[PDB]
């Protein structure tokens, strides 16, 4: 193997931030989501299949 990371070349590399942006589901997406959940329960969700 040969492995190196940015820590050796660091302090010249700028910062890296991971943001998390939350977006609420829309109205028709809330209706369609629950619709697919119920219709999926009619198929027994196919979880163990």
């Amino acid at each position: 193997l040969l492995r190196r990371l940015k820590a050796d070349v660091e302090k010249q590399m700028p910062a890296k931030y991971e943001h998390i942006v939350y977006c609420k589901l829309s109205k028709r997406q809330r209706f369609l989501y629950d619709d697919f959940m119920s219709r999926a329960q009619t198929k027994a969700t196919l979880a163990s299949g």
Binding site: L1, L2, R3, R4, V9
Partner: protein
């Protein structure tokens, strides 16, 4: 590591030169290994070198 640079015309940094340093033990000893370096550190420059 005693590299002869000729036809290197581009410029390489120190840790990549160490990449060729650790690459010198492969072909000279007839050994094959995986070189995995952090993305953005220019492995291709090491291969071309």
């Amino acid at each position: 590591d005693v590299p002869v640079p000729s036809l290197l015309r581009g410029n390489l940094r120190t840790y990549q030169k160490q990449g060729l340093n650790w690459l010198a033990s492969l072909y000279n000893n007839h050994t094959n290994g995986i070189l995995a370096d952090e993305m953005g550190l220019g492995k291709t420059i090491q291969t071309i070198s």
